[PDB]
Amino acid sequence: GGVCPKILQRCRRDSDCPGACICRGNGYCGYPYDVPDYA
Numbered sequence: 001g002g003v004c005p006k007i008l009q010r011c012r013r014d015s016d017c018p019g020a021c022i023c024r025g026n027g028y029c030g031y032p033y034d035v036p037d038y039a
Contacts, residue, residue, distance in 0.1 A: 001039050002030040 004021040009032075011023030021029040031038040 003033060003035065003038055004030045005033045008032045008034075 002020060002022055004017070004019060006019060006021065006029075009017060009021070009029045010027060011017050011021075011029045014022045017023055017029035023029060024031070
C-alpha cells in the first residue's frame with residue numbers, strides 16, 4: 001500500500017516523509033519496501 005521504496009525513516013509529520021510516504025502511528029514513515037508483509 002503506502003509502502004516506501006526508501007529506507008526506514010522516522011516521521012515527525014507526513015511532509016517529513018519524502019514521496020508517497022506518510023507518517024504512521026508506529027512513529028515511522030510508511031513501511032519500507034523491505035517490509036514484505038505490507039503493501
